[PDB]
Amino acid sequence: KVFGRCELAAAMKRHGLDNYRGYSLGNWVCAAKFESNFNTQATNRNTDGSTDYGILQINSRWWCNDGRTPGSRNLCNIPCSALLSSDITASVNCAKKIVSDGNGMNAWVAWRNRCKGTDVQAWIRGCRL
Numbered sequence: 001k002v003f004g005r006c007e008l009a010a011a012m013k014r015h016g017l018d019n020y021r022g023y024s025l026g027n028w029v030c031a032a033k034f035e036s037n038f039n040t041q042a043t044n045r046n047t048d049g050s051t052d053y054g055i056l057q058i059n060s061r062w063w064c065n066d067g068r069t070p071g072s073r074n075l076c077n078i079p080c081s082a083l084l085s086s087d088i089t090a091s092v093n094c095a096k097k098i099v100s101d102g103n104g105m106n107a108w109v110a111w112r113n114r115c116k117g118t119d120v121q122a123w124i125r126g127c128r129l
């Protein structure tokens with residue numbers, strides 16, 4: 001599924017991401033835009049052989065099991081394919097654990113490089129929430 005920008009903002013708000021750990025909704029929409037272009041089916045392989053999954057590009061090195069990242073962990077206790085569903089619940093629940101692990105949203109490179117320090121409220125402008 002390829003979300004509309006306001007559609008995704010509304011789905012994230014319902015799932016408790018607005019203000020989660022102090023990160024307003026615009027930050028999460030911004031990160032999703034640049035990580036996956038709002039596409040739940042996005043996958044990208046990393047140099048170390050791990051893969052990033054889903055609309056927040058969660059990494060199999062630490063967070064999910066894809067059966068092909070030797071020596072990796074599965075801290076979110078999920079198959080990585082659950083991160084590609086049209087239902088964003090599993091991605092959101094796992095992102096909540098990531099952003100709480102001490103490093104906030106700096107875990108998402110695109111957030112650090114393209115959202116941090118910008119007017120992220122622009123990403124939820126005009127949406128009915």
Ligand SMILES: [Cl-]
Binds near residue numbers: 120121122
């Ligand atoms: Cl915001």
Ligand SMILES: [Cl-]
Binds near residue numbers: 109110113114
């Ligand atoms: Cl980047």
Ligand code: NA
Binds near residue numbers: 061062064
């Ligand atoms: Na893993």
